[PDB]
Amino acid sequence: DEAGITGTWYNQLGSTFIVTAGADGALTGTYESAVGNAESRYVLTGRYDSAPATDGSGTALGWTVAWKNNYRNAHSATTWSGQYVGGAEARINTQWLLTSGTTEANAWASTYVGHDTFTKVK
Amino acid sequence: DEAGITGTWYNQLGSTFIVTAGADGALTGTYESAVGNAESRYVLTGRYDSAPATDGSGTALGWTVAWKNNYRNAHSATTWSGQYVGGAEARINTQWLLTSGTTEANAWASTYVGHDTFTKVK
Amino acid sequence: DEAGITGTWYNQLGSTFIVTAGADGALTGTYESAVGNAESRYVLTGRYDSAPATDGSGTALGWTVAWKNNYRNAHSATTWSGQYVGGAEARINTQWLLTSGTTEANAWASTYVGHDTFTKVK
Amino acid sequence: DEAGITGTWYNQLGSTFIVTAGADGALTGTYESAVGNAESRYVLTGRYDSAPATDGSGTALGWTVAWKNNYRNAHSATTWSGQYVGGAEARINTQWLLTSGTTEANAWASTYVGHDTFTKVK
């Protein structure tokens, strides 16, 4: 599903995920968040299962954004973990972890969890 | 903290995380899990905050492994989200999400969550 | 929102959440899962914010089910953490953690994470 | 493990978890957080597996605190999901989800995730 994953994806917040899937399992591209301490595009990298099951299962993948670019630095990183489901209404269904750099005193409150659904439309 | 992050790290399960931190914010290397459906080394990639706060906060980072190599394919991916804390007893404190490719019927049970602490010794 | 929370709720899997909100912050009732190692109703208990903000924010709440009843014992517990949002299309938006009892060797894989949205219809 | 669970527990932050396990699977008691927007004791309720496996597995359990008492209201709730492991150095190993009431605009950032280990000493 190199073909299926490569392209522009949009989540429910109106963020934009631009990815290229490599034959080797690499994910490379850019992320633009519609929310939070973010402006314009950020580098992303990650990995995907390049030889998924042929039993109708989804394709496991994940990626990371560190929220530093030429405009802003939010001293934080998000990782999305999820699966690509192909077909007419293709989706990437994810859960994510957003960690901030903190002092040791605040480290118990370092990490947000959430979930994003990406589609090829909107 | 390019210097501080680059190297070999070990978690509480005895897994081995071999990483290089690029000046640009890139993380590249290999992961070897002591547990689960895993043998030998797997590619990893990720990102880190290459200009962290100077107030004693940690350095945000994350990375992904897709559990496919030349030996095995577990049809799954893990993402670690966390922060690097420098000093005498350097640590990377993480939380992780492990997603399997599933059928739509089993997708509610696709994702494990856990936490790993990495040190430079053991 | 004692009135708003008390009643029958349904999630996206077709599970049924029957709850009573007490004036004191208590949640009591029963849960019936449409999926997994579950049959019929299980006891639940939890808590909610009985004096929420008046700025349009949601109402924080959570509850637990241990997956033991007179029919089955799945040696596991789920906790839902989320917020109640009132109005014409009332919702409870949650994230959950499902922990199994495990051996120490398997404890790294003890816990699933997911998300459920509850509505008063369907 | 009604006997094993009932009592006073302490986590790595120095919080105090005072619980009674009922023969029926109930957990009732009080929680006092050493960190965050919290003072003194808060009600908790939850559930546990009252007939755990006899193969050395842990005992699944969970509980909720809504962060309202007579002193403060943090408009938030935490759920802990975990397992009790008996013996010389008894532990409750948990992961938790802390949800705040938010506006719909901030709901993506409503929930923290973390992990607490409780012991009978300290």
Short mmCIF file of C-alpha atoms in Angstrom, two decimals:
data_model
loop_
_atom_site.label_atom_id
_atom_site.label_comp_id
_atom_site.label_asym_id
_atom_site.label_seq_id
_atom_site.Cartn_x
_atom_site.Cartn_y
_atom_site.Cartn_z
CA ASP A 1 0.00 0.00 0.00
CA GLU A 2 2.90 2.40 -0.82
CA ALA A 3 0.42 3.82 -3.44
CA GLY A 4 -2.48 3.92 -0.91
CA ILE A 5 -0.58 5.79 1.83
CA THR A 6 1.40 8.31 -0.26
CA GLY A 7 -0.42 11.63 -0.62
CA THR A 8 -2.24 14.36 1.27
CA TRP A 9 -4.44 13.46 4.26
CA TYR A 10 -6.70 15.57 6.45
CA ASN A 11 -7.95 14.95 10.00
CA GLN A 12 -11.10 16.02 11.88
CA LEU A 13 -9.38 19.24 13.18
CA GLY A 14 -8.52 20.31 9.59
CA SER A 15 -4.80 19.48 9.97
CA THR A 16 -2.86 18.44 6.81
CA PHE A 17 -0.57 15.37 6.74
CA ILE A 18 1.59 15.18 3.52
CA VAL A 19 3.42 11.83 3.34
CA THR A 20 5.49 9.70 1.01
CA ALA A 21 5.67 5.94 1.71
CA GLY A 22 9.01 4.37 0.59
CA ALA A 23 9.31 0.77 -0.74
CA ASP A 24 11.55 0.04 2.34
CA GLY A 25 8.89 1.05 4.97
CA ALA A 26 9.90 4.74 5.34
CA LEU A 27 7.42 7.60 5.86
CA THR A 28 8.63 11.13 5.12
CA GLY A 29 6.80 14.41 4.70
CA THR A 30 5.26 17.40 6.45
CA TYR A 31 2.50 18.12 8.97
CA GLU A 32 0.52 21.31 9.43
CA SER A 33 -1.62 21.47 12.61
CA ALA A 34 -4.87 23.50 12.55
CA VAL A 35 -4.62 23.80 16.40
CA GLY A 36 -2.11 24.43 19.15
CA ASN A 37 1.23 26.21 19.27
CA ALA A 38 1.94 25.58 15.58
CA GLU A 39 2.34 27.54 12.37
CA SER A 40 3.02 26.28 8.84
CA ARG A 41 4.71 22.93 8.09
CA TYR A 42 6.86 20.68 10.31
CA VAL A 43 9.04 17.77 9.28
CA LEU A 44 7.73 14.30 9.95
CA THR A 45 9.30 10.89 9.68
CA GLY A 46 8.03 7.42 10.49
CA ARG A 47 7.59 3.82 9.44
CA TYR A 48 4.89 1.49 8.08
CA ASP A 49 4.45 -2.24 7.52
CA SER A 50 5.48 -2.62 3.82
CA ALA A 51 4.21 -6.28 3.66
CA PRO A 52 0.83 -6.23 5.45
CA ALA A 53 -1.48 -9.23 6.01
CA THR A 54 -3.72 -10.18 3.02
CA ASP A 55 -6.75 -11.14 5.27
CA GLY A 56 -8.42 -7.65 5.17
CA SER A 57 -6.42 -6.34 8.18
CA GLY A 58 -5.21 -2.75 8.17
CA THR A 59 -1.58 -1.67 7.68
CA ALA A 60 0.27 -0.60 10.87
CA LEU A 61 2.19 2.69 10.77
CA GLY A 62 3.44 5.53 12.90
CA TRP A 63 5.15 8.88 12.66
CA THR A 64 6.62 11.68 14.70
CA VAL A 65 6.58 15.50 14.49
CA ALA A 66 8.84 17.63 16.73
CA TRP A 67 7.07 21.01 16.98
CA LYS A 68 10.11 23.14 15.94
CA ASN A 69 10.34 24.90 12.56
CA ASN A 70 11.70 28.25 11.35
CA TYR A 71 8.68 30.09 12.85
CA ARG A 72 8.05 28.53 16.28
CA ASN A 73 9.28 26.02 18.83
CA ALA A 74 6.64 24.46 21.10
CA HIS A 75 9.28 22.24 22.88
CA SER A 76 7.12 19.20 22.27
CA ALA A 77 6.73 16.18 20.00
CA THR A 78 3.72 14.17 18.88
CA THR A 79 3.75 10.53 17.78
CA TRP A 80 0.81 9.01 15.95
CA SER A 81 0.36 5.21 16.01
CA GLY A 82 -2.31 3.66 13.88
CA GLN A 83 -3.43 1.72 10.87
CA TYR A 84 -4.20 2.50 7.22
CA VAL A 85 -7.45 0.99 5.92
CA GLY A 86 -7.71 1.06 2.11
CA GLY A 87 -10.75 1.32 -0.18
CA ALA A 88 -13.38 3.80 -1.45
CA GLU A 89 -13.32 5.74 1.87
CA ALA A 90 -9.65 5.16 2.79
CA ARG A 91 -8.72 6.13 6.37
CA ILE A 92 -5.75 6.30 8.69
CA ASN A 93 -7.09 5.66 12.24
CA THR A 94 -4.64 6.88 14.90
CA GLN A 95 -4.02 7.43 18.53
CA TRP A 96 -1.35 9.96 19.51
CA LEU A 97 0.92 11.00 22.38
CA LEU A 98 2.08 14.63 22.65
CA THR A 99 5.00 15.05 25.08
CA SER A 100 6.34 18.47 26.21
CA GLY A 101 9.79 19.06 27.66
CA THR A 102 9.16 19.70 31.37
CA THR A 103 10.95 20.14 34.65
CA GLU A 104 11.08 16.96 36.81
CA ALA A 105 8.42 18.61 39.09
CA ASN A 106 5.92 18.88 36.14
CA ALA A 107 6.87 15.60 34.35
CA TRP A 108 3.73 13.79 35.61
CA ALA A 109 1.76 16.27 33.36
CA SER A 110 4.13 16.05 30.34
CA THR A 111 1.97 13.96 27.99
CA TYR A 112 -1.42 14.41 26.23
CA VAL A 113 -3.22 11.49 24.57
CA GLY A 114 -5.77 11.73 21.80
CA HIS A 115 -7.04 10.24 18.58
CA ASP A 116 -7.10 11.53 14.97
CA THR A 117 -8.85 10.05 11.93
CA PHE A 118 -7.33 10.99 8.56
CA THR A 119 -9.20 10.91 5.21
CA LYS A 120 -8.14 11.81 1.65
CA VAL A 121 -11.03 14.40 1.43
CA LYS A 122 -11.61 17.73 3.31
CA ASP B 1 21.66 17.75 23.06
CA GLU B 2 22.71 16.03 19.78
CA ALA B 3 25.73 14.76 21.83
CA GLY B 4 23.56 13.67 24.79
CA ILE B 5 20.99 11.70 22.76
CA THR B 6 23.27 9.96 20.22
CA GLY B 7 24.36 6.52 21.37
CA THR B 8 23.12 3.23 22.79
CA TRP B 9 20.23 3.17 25.31
CA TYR B 10 18.66 0.34 27.28
CA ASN B 11 15.18 0.08 28.83
CA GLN B 12 13.80 -1.80 31.83
CA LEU B 13 12.90 -4.88 29.65
CA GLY B 14 16.53 -5.13 28.38
CA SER B 15 15.67 -3.76 24.91
CA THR B 16 18.42 -1.84 23.00
CA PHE B 17 17.77 1.52 21.30
CA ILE B 18 20.68 2.65 19.02
CA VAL B 19 20.14 6.24 17.83
CA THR B 20 21.87 9.07 16.03
CA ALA B 21 20.56 12.62 16.58
CA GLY B 22 21.07 14.89 13.52
CA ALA B 23 21.76 18.66 13.83
CA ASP B 24 18.41 19.15 11.90
CA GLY B 25 16.23 17.31 14.52
CA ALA B 26 16.38 13.83 12.88
CA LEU B 27 16.58 10.54 14.82
CA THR B 28 17.79 7.45 12.95
CA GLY B 29 18.91 4.04 14.15
CA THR B 30 17.86 0.58 15.22
CA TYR B 31 15.73 -1.04 17.94
CA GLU B 32 16.02 -4.53 19.33
CA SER B 33 13.13 -5.64 21.59
CA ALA B 34 13.84 -8.12 24.40
CA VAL B 35 10.10 -9.08 24.33
CA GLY B 36 7.26 -9.78 21.97
CA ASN B 37 7.12 -10.97 18.36
CA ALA B 38 10.57 -9.57 17.53
CA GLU B 39 14.03 -10.81 16.57
CA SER B 40 17.21 -8.84 15.93
CA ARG B 41 17.24 -5.17 14.84
CA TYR B 42 14.47 -3.04 13.28
CA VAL B 43 14.80 0.33 11.58
CA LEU B 44 13.67 3.36 13.55
CA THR B 45 13.22 6.98 12.64
CA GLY B 46 11.96 9.98 14.58
CA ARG B 47 12.43 13.59 15.58
CA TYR B 48 13.62 15.62 18.57
CA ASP B 49 13.57 19.27 19.64
CA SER B 50 17.05 20.47 18.48
CA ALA B 51 16.73 23.83 20.38
CA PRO B 52 15.23 22.89 23.78
CA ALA B 53 14.44 25.34 26.60
CA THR B 54 17.41 26.39 28.81
CA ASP B 55 15.30 26.44 32.10
CA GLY B 56 16.23 22.79 33.01
CA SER B 57 13.26 21.32 31.06
CA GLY B 58 13.74 18.04 29.22
CA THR B 59 14.09 17.68 25.45
CA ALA B 60 10.94 16.38 23.63
CA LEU B 61 11.42 13.53 21.15
CA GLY B 62 9.70 10.60 19.53
CA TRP B 63 10.35 7.69 17.24
CA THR B 64 8.66 4.84 15.41
CA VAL B 65 9.52 1.17 14.74
CA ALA B 66 7.46 -0.90 12.29
CA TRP B 67 7.96 -4.53 13.42
CA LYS B 68 9.05 -5.89 9.99
CA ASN B 69 12.64 -6.94 9.23
CA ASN B 70 14.26 -9.75 7.23
CA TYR B 71 13.38 -12.31 9.95
CA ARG B 72 9.83 -11.52 11.09
CA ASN B 73 6.76 -9.36 10.46
CA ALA B 74 4.52 -8.71 13.47
CA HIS B 75 2.16 -6.45 11.40
CA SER B 76 2.46 -3.71 14.02
CA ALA B 77 4.22 -0.45 14.81
CA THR B 78 5.26 1.19 18.07
CA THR B 79 5.70 4.93 18.63
CA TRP B 80 7.53 6.24 21.68
CA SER B 81 6.85 9.83 22.81
CA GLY B 82 8.97 11.27 25.58
CA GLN B 83 11.70 13.53 26.84
CA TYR B 84 15.45 13.29 27.24
CA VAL B 85 16.81 14.44 30.61
CA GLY B 86 20.56 15.07 30.65
CA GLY B 87 23.15 14.69 33.42
CA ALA B 88 25.06 12.10 35.49
CA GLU B 89 22.12 9.63 35.27
CA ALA B 90 20.76 10.60 31.81
CA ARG B 91 17.34 9.17 30.94
CA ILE B 92 14.82 9.09 28.14
CA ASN B 93 11.34 8.83 29.81
CA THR B 94 8.70 7.59 27.35
CA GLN B 95 5.18 6.49 26.85
CA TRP B 96 4.39 4.32 23.83
CA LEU B 97 1.54 3.17 21.61
CA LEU B 98 1.75 -0.23 19.83
CA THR B 99 -0.82 -0.57 17.02
CA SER B 100 -1.47 -3.86 15.16
CA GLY B 101 -3.14 -4.08 11.77
CA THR B 102 -6.60 -5.50 12.51
CA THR B 103 -9.90 -6.26 10.89
CA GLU B 104 -12.58 -3.54 11.45
CA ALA B 105 -14.31 -5.97 13.92
CA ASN B 106 -11.14 -6.11 16.14
CA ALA B 107 -9.99 -2.45 15.69
CA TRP B 108 -11.25 -1.49 19.18
CA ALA B 109 -8.46 -3.81 20.52
CA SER B 110 -5.73 -2.65 18.05
CA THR B 111 -3.56 -0.55 20.39
CA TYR B 112 -1.46 -1.25 23.53
CA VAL B 113 -0.13 1.59 25.69
CA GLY B 114 2.86 1.42 27.98
CA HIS B 115 5.88 3.26 29.33
CA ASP B 116 9.64 2.66 28.92
CA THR B 117 12.54 4.35 30.71
CA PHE B 118 15.86 4.29 28.83
CA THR B 119 19.30 4.67 30.49
CA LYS B 120 22.86 4.64 29.10
CA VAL B 121 23.78 1.66 31.42
CA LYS B 122 22.50 -1.99 31.48
CA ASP C 1 -25.82 18.09 34.97
CA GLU C 2 -27.11 15.25 37.23
CA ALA C 3 -30.22 15.26 34.91
CA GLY C 4 -28.12 15.42 31.71
CA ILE C 5 -25.84 12.45 32.59
CA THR C 6 -28.37 10.08 34.19
CA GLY C 7 -29.86 7.62 31.69
CA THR C 8 -29.00 5.17 28.92
CA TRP C 9 -26.07 5.86 26.56
CA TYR C 10 -24.80 4.00 23.52
CA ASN C 11 -21.33 4.02 21.92
CA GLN C 12 -20.10 3.49 18.36
CA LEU C 13 -19.68 -0.31 18.95
CA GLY C 14 -23.33 -0.60 20.10
CA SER C 15 -22.40 -1.05 23.79
CA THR C 16 -24.95 0.16 26.42
CA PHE C 17 -23.94 2.36 29.39
CA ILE C 18 -26.76 2.72 32.00
CA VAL C 19 -25.83 5.32 34.62
CA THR C 20 -27.25 7.29 37.52
CA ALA C 21 -25.49 10.53 38.54
CA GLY C 22 -25.80 11.30 42.29
CA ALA C 23 -26.04 14.88 43.70
CA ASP C 24 -22.69 14.09 45.52
CA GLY C 25 -20.67 13.27 42.31
CA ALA C 26 -21.30 9.47 42.27
CA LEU C 27 -21.82 7.41 39.10
CA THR C 28 -23.46 4.00 39.47
CA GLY C 29 -24.97 1.62 36.96
CA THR C 30 -24.33 -1.13 34.44
CA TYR C 31 -22.33 -1.66 31.25
CA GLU C 32 -23.00 -4.13 28.48
CA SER C 33 -20.19 -4.49 25.88
CA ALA C 34 -21.12 -5.39 22.28
CA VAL C 35 -17.51 -6.72 21.80
CA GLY C 36 -14.87 -8.74 23.58
CA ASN C 37 -14.96 -11.37 26.31
CA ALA C 38 -18.24 -10.06 27.75
CA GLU C 39 -21.86 -11.17 28.16
CA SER C 40 -24.80 -9.30 29.69
CA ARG C 41 -24.40 -6.49 32.25
CA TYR C 42 -21.43 -5.61 34.52
CA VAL C 43 -21.40 -3.30 37.50
CA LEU C 44 -19.86 0.10 37.04
CA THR C 45 -18.99 2.88 39.42
CA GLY C 46 -17.33 6.25 38.94
CA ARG C 47 -17.34 9.95 39.66
CA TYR C 48 -18.19 13.21 37.88
CA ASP C 49 -17.67 16.93 38.51
CA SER C 50 -21.00 17.93 40.15
CA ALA C 51 -20.21 21.73 39.90
CA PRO C 52 -18.78 22.18 36.38
CA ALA C 53 -17.57 25.49 34.89
CA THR C 54 -20.34 27.75 33.44
CA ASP C 55 -18.14 28.97 30.46
CA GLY C 56 -19.42 26.28 27.98
CA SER C 57 -16.79 23.70 29.10
CA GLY C 58 -17.71 20.04 29.36
CA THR C 59 -18.20 18.11 32.60
CA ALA C 60 -15.29 15.78 33.57
CA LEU C 61 -16.17 12.22 34.58
CA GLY C 62 -14.89 8.68 34.68
CA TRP C 63 -15.93 5.17 35.50
CA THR C 64 -14.66 1.63 35.88
CA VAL C 65 -15.97 -1.82 34.89
CA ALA C 66 -14.27 -5.01 36.14
CA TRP C 67 -15.15 -7.69 33.56
CA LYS C 68 -16.51 -10.25 36.08
CA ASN C 69 -20.22 -11.10 36.42
CA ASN C 70 -22.23 -14.28 37.02
CA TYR C 71 -21.58 -15.47 33.42
CA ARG C 72 -17.91 -14.73 32.71
CA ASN C 73 -14.65 -13.41 34.10
CA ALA C 74 -12.26 -11.79 31.60
CA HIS C 75 -9.70 -10.97 34.38
CA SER C 76 -9.57 -7.37 33.21
CA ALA C 77 -10.92 -3.89 33.98
CA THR C 78 -11.65 -0.88 31.78
CA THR C 79 -11.64 2.76 32.93
CA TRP C 80 -13.20 5.48 30.80
CA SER C 81 -12.07 9.09 31.33
CA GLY C 82 -13.89 11.84 29.53
CA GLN C 83 -16.29 14.72 29.47
CA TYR C 84 -20.04 15.15 29.11
CA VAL C 85 -21.13 17.82 26.60
CA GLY C 86 -24.81 18.79 26.97
CA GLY C 87 -27.36 20.03 24.39
CA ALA C 88 -29.47 18.82 21.43
CA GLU C 89 -26.84 16.18 20.45
CA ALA C 90 -25.49 15.42 23.97
CA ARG C 91 -22.30 13.30 24.03
CA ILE C 92 -19.88 11.71 26.44
CA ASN C 93 -16.45 11.79 24.73
CA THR C 94 -14.03 9.29 26.32
CA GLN C 95 -10.69 7.66 26.20
CA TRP C 96 -10.25 4.30 27.94
CA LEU C 97 -7.63 1.97 29.37
CA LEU C 98 -8.30 -1.80 29.48
CA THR C 99 -5.88 -3.64 31.79
CA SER C 100 -5.68 -7.47 32.01
CA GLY C 101 -4.14 -9.35 34.92
CA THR C 102 -0.86 -10.74 33.54
CA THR C 103 2.29 -12.49 34.59
CA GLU C 104 5.29 -10.14 35.18
CA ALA C 105 6.77 -11.46 31.84
CA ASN C 106 3.67 -10.24 29.89
CA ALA C 107 2.97 -7.03 31.92
CA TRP C 108 4.43 -4.79 29.16
CA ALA C 109 1.41 -5.93 27.02
CA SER C 110 -1.23 -5.67 29.84
CA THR C 111 -3.04 -2.51 28.68
CA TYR C 112 -5.13 -1.49 25.62
CA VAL C 113 -6.04 2.14 24.94
CA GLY C 114 -8.97 3.37 22.91
CA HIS C 115 -11.72 5.93 22.57
CA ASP C 116 -15.52 5.68 22.78
CA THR C 117 -18.14 8.32 22.00
CA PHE C 118 -21.51 7.88 23.75
CA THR C 119 -24.84 9.33 22.53
CA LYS C 120 -28.39 9.14 23.88
CA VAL C 121 -29.62 7.65 20.50
CA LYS C 122 -28.91 4.24 18.83
CA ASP D 1 -7.12 -10.45 47.31
CA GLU D 2 -9.70 -8.34 49.24
CA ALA D 3 -7.15 -8.48 52.16
CA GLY D 4 -4.18 -7.69 49.84
CA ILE D 5 -5.76 -4.58 48.23
CA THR D 6 -7.48 -3.00 51.27
CA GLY D 7 -5.30 -0.41 52.99
CA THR D 8 -3.07 2.61 52.43
CA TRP D 9 -0.93 2.86 49.29
CA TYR D 10 1.63 5.41 48.18
CA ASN D 11 2.88 6.28 44.67
CA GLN D 12 6.20 7.65 43.37
CA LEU D 13 4.92 11.30 43.62
CA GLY D 14 4.09 10.79 47.35
CA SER D 15 0.31 10.68 46.77
CA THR D 16 -1.83 8.60 49.21
CA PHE D 17 -4.47 6.10 47.99
CA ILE D 18 -6.71 4.82 50.86
CA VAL D 19 -8.94 1.95 49.63
CA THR D 20 -11.34 -0.70 50.85
CA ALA D 21 -11.96 -3.72 48.60
CA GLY D 22 -15.51 -5.20 48.98
CA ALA D 23 -16.22 -8.96 48.66
CA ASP D 24 -18.48 -7.98 45.66
CA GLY D 25 -15.65 -6.29 43.62
CA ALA D 26 -16.17 -2.70 44.91
CA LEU D 27 -13.37 -0.22 45.63
CA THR D 28 -14.16 2.75 47.87
CA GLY D 29 -11.93 5.27 49.61
CA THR D 30 -10.01 8.51 49.31
CA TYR D 31 -7.10 9.91 47.27
CA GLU D 32 -4.75 12.72 48.18
CA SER D 33 -2.51 13.98 45.34
CA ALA D 34 0.94 15.37 46.20
CA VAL D 35 0.86 17.34 42.88
CA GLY D 36 -1.47 19.41 40.74
CA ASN D 37 -4.58 21.46 41.50
CA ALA D 38 -5.46 19.37 44.57
CA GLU D 39 -5.73 19.75 48.34
CA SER D 40 -6.63 17.20 50.98
CA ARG D 41 -8.74 14.08 50.25
CA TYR D 42 -11.07 13.32 47.30
CA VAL D 43 -13.64 10.56 47.03
CA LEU D 44 -12.76 7.60 44.87
CA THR D 45 -14.72 4.60 43.67
CA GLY D 46 -13.81 1.71 41.42
CA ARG D 47 -13.89 -2.01 40.78
CA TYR D 48 -11.53 -5.00 40.92
CA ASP D 49 -11.55 -8.63 39.77
CA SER D 50 -12.74 -10.46 42.95
CA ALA D 51 -11.92 -13.95 41.45
CA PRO D 52 -8.51 -13.53 39.77
CA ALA D 53 -6.57 -16.25 37.91
CA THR D 54 -4.52 -18.68 40.09
CA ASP D 55 -1.57 -18.92 37.55
CA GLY D 56 0.50 -16.07 39.15
CA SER D 57 -1.25 -13.33 37.08
CA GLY D 58 -2.03 -9.98 38.68
CA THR D 59 -5.49 -8.79 39.70
CA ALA D 60 -7.12 -6.23 37.34
CA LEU D 61 -8.64 -3.10 38.92
CA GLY D 62 -9.49 0.51 38.28
CA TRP D 63 -10.77 3.60 40.01
CA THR D 64 -11.84 7.19 39.42
CA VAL D 65 -11.32 10.49 41.29
CA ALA D 66 -13.24 13.63 40.25
CA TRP D 67 -11.09 16.54 41.46
CA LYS D 68 -13.86 18.35 43.42
CA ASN D 69 -13.98 18.47 47.23
CA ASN D 70 -14.94 21.11 49.80
CA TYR D 71 -11.66 23.02 49.17
CA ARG D 72 -11.16 23.06 45.40
CA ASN D 73 -12.61 22.08 42.03
CA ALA D 74 -10.11 21.36 39.24
CA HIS D 75 -12.94 20.50 36.77
CA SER D 76 -11.21 17.23 35.92
CA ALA D 77 -11.25 13.50 36.64
CA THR D 78 -8.51 10.85 36.68
CA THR D 79 -9.02 7.12 36.06
CA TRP D 80 -6.35 4.61 36.98
CA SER D 81 -6.37 1.20 35.26
CA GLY D 82 -3.95 -1.43 36.46
CA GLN D 83 -3.18 -4.62 38.25
CA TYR D 84 -2.40 -5.59 41.84
CA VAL D 85 0.59 -7.90 42.28
CA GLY D 86 0.73 -9.53 45.73
CA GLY D 87 3.67 -10.69 47.89
CA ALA D 88 6.60 -9.34 49.95
CA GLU D 89 6.86 -6.14 47.83
CA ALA D 90 3.16 -5.82 46.85
CA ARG D 91 2.47 -3.28 44.11
CA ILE D 92 -0.38 -1.75 42.15
CA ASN D 93 0.99 -0.95 38.65
CA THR D 94 -1.23 1.60 36.85
CA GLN D 95 -1.69 3.76 33.84
CA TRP D 96 -3.99 6.75 34.13
CA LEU D 97 -6.03 9.21 32.07
CA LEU D 98 -6.72 12.73 33.43
CA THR D 99 -9.54 14.50 31.53
CA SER D 100 -10.41 18.20 32.04
CA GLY D 101 -13.72 19.77 31.07
CA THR D 102 -12.90 21.89 28.02
CA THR D 103 -14.49 23.95 25.31
CA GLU D 104 -15.02 22.05 22.00
CA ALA D 105 -12.10 24.19 20.58
CA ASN D 106 -9.66 22.85 23.27
CA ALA D 107 -11.04 19.26 23.48
CA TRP D 108 -8.10 17.82 21.47
CA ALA D 109 -5.93 18.81 24.51
CA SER D 110 -8.38 17.59 27.21
CA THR D 111 -6.56 14.44 28.36
CA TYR D 112 -3.18 13.64 30.02
CA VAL D 113 -1.80 10.11 30.21
CA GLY D 114 0.66 8.81 32.73
CA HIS D 115 1.66 5.92 34.94
CA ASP D 116 1.78 5.48 38.74
CA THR D 117 3.25 2.62 40.77
CA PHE D 118 1.76 2.19 44.26
CA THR D 119 3.50 0.43 47.19
CA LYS D 120 2.48 -0.19 50.82
CA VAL D 121 5.66 1.64 52.06
CA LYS D 122 6.65 5.37 51.89
#
